[PDB]
């Protein structure tokens, strides 16, 4: 329901889908610039990736994996 490169808010709806023949509010949870990734109409499974976004508050460092047997 938005477009690419659009600022959003916490708690702001960003998509709406039909599941089990019924609607679902895809509520956004964090504010920032969205770039819509997974193009619409495709079936998806839990834990998929639908978008990236550039938030306005960056945060701490993140993962670096090193362990191998």
């Amino acid at each position: 329901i938005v477009e690419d490169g659009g600022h959003v808010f916490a708690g702001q709806c960003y998509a709406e889908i039909e599941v089990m023949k019924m609607v679902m509010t895809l509520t956004a949870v964090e504010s920032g610039c969205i770039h819509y990734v997974k193009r619409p109409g495709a079936a998806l499974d839990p834990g998929c990736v639908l978008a990236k976004m550039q938030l306005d508050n960056p945060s701490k460092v993140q993962q670096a994996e090193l362990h191998t047997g």
Binding site: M20, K21, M22, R39, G41, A42
Partner: protein, 542 residues
């Protein structure tokens, strides 16, 4: 008991012969109940109840005081929610009001035509509310709605303002059926709910396991309940003698475990038998943004009753054996997607041209190929979307009409006027065919169709053929032939009299051929009155 069974049978026949109605005022017990259902059309006053055996007896048999009031078992909250009761009323007065109001649509007897009114709602008006792909309350579509801003005007529906009187409203609410008036012509009416219904299932208090479930029921589907409700409504109106207007919008039958277990297939067969026995026009129209698929078309093709059925589609309606996704699933796989790139996509064509170059390092090959798969895979979804559109373009009315399976493409804005006048002459012509069939039942539908048109062309001239396709002019013309008694208009009647004479002659001639011994004595009686001149001439040719 003898008397009761006797009148049960008699009443079953009555239902097949005339209109039966029943009013539940206080309580209907046993045979009274059975008579009420046999009456079929049932109005139920509040605080009445409908039972066979009393709560006391049943509680004792069941060892405890399960039930406290017959209303728990037979009240309006059961029969109105399940379609056993057709209408509910607060009192007897309101019952009678409903009776006469229904009756204002119905013919005095079966030998008589529907009573026509001169209505104050004109015929050549436009419909202000416009149906949308987005779901909507169909009451706006049928009866109209208030205008959102000015609020003192009315956004007109398809049918005449204030004329629509619903039935079975709270039961099986995925479909809505009823009676209405179009310019004061009573019609039967079928429409489709588009939003998901939320159905309440009551708890069985006898059984502690049963809890009240709550079910989502998708739109555009026929269920067992819907099919049953439909069979009963179609038959009843059919036994009244009304034409039908269907605002058709069905995606398919529900094929899920529950409905399959519950025998939806059986009730589809029954509807088929019922309409096959239908005797007056059925007009089906798929409105804009609706679609009609597979089984639903098959079971309502005009071939079942060509004599009486007609089908119309809006430009923005759609219909096929199979929806795009499943057609695509079979006839648009990966191979076809790559193939399509190979013909049309410049990046794929260009890249493929380069992969089609000799003496490249296998490094260069694999790098190009990966770049190709990445481009391809990224491109696959959209190109699938294009595919479904492509399939959808196969489903249009043009093809249907070219092969002769549909009668016309309509335009929604002016569809009302067309259907009014069209129905008026289709119906009147049918009435005349009934008159003809009465004149000689042995003639086939085809030959009956034939000759009437030809007698018209004979009288009014081959040059005037085209007029036949003008509803209005033949309608006005037909009426003058029909209305002036003992005029110069009983021409078709005179011709029919000749045909009747011919048919009668065939009956006596055939009868004597089978039974020649009867001839001589038949003559004495036949000779019993005739002109003296005929007697002499008979001697001359003897």
């Amino acid at each position: 008991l003898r008397g009761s069974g006797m009148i049960a049978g008699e009443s079953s026949l009555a239902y097949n012969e005339i209109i039966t109605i029943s009013l539940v005022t206080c309580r209907a017990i046993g045979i009274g109940a059975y008579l009420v259902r046999l009456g079929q059309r049932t109005i139920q006053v509040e605080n009445s109840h409908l039972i066979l055996t009393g709560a006391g007896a049943l509680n004792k048999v069941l060892g405890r005081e399960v039930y406290t009031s017959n209303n728990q078992l037979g009240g309006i909250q059961i029969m109105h929610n399940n379609g056993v009761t057709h209408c509910t009323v607060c009192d007897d007065f309101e019952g009678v009001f409903t009776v006469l109001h229904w009756l204002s649509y119905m013919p005095k007897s079966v030998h008589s035509s529907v009573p026509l009114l001169n209505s104050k709602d004109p015929i050549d008006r436009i419909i202000e509310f416009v149906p949308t792909k987005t779901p909507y309350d169909p009451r706006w579509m049928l009866a109209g709605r208030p205008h959102p801003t000015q609020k003192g005007q009315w956004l007109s529906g398809f049918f005449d303002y204030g004329s629509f009187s619903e039935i079975m409203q709270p039961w099986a609410q995925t479909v809505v059926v009823g009676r209405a008036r179009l310019g004061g012509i009573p019609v039967g009416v079928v429409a489709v709910e588009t939003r998901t219904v939320e159905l309440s299932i009551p708890a069985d208090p006898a059984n502690l396991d049963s809890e009240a479930k709550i079910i989502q029921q998708a739109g555009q589907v026929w269920f067992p309940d819907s099919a049953f409700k439909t069979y009963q409504a179609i038959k009843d109106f059919n036994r009244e003698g009304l034409p039908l207007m269907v605002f058709a919008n069905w995606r398919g039958f529900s094929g899920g475990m529950k409905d399959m277990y519950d025998q939806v297939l059986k009730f589809g067969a029954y509807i088929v038998d019922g309409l096959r026995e239908c005797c007056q026009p059925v007009l089906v129209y798929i409105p804009p943004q609706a679609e009609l698929r597979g089984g639903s078309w098959v079971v309502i093709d005009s071939s079942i009753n060509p004599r009486h059925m007609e089908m119309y589609a809006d430009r923005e309606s759609r219909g096929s054996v199979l929806e795009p996704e499943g057609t695509v699933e079979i006839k648009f796989r990966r191979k076809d997607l790559v193939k399509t790139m190979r013909r049309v996509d410049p990046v794929y064509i260009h890249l493929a041209e380069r992969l089609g170059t000799p003496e490249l390092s296998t490094a260069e090959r694999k790098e190009l190929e990966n770049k190709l798969k990445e481009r391809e895979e990224f491109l696959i979804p959209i190109y699938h979307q294009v595919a479904v559109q492509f399939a959808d373009l196969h489903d249009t009315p043009g093809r249907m009409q070219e092969k002769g399976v549909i009668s016309d493409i309509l335009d929604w804005k002016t569809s009302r006027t067309f259907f009014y006048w069209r129905l008026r002459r289709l119906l009147l012509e049918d009435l005349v065919k009934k008159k003809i069939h009465n004149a000689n039942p042995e003639l086939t539908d085809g030959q009956i169709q034939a000759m009437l048109r030809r007698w018209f062309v004979e009288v009014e001239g081959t040059v005037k053929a085209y007029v036949w396709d003008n509803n209005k002019d033949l309608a006005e013309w037909l009426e003058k032939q029909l209305t002036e008694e003992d005029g110069v208009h009983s021409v078709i009647e005179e011709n029919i009299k000749c045909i009747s004479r011919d048919y009668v002659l065939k009956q006596i001639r055939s009868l004597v051929q089978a039974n020649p011994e009867v001839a001589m004595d038949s003559i004495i009686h036949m000779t019993q009155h005739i002109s003296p001149t005929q007697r002499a001439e008979v001697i001359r040719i003897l």
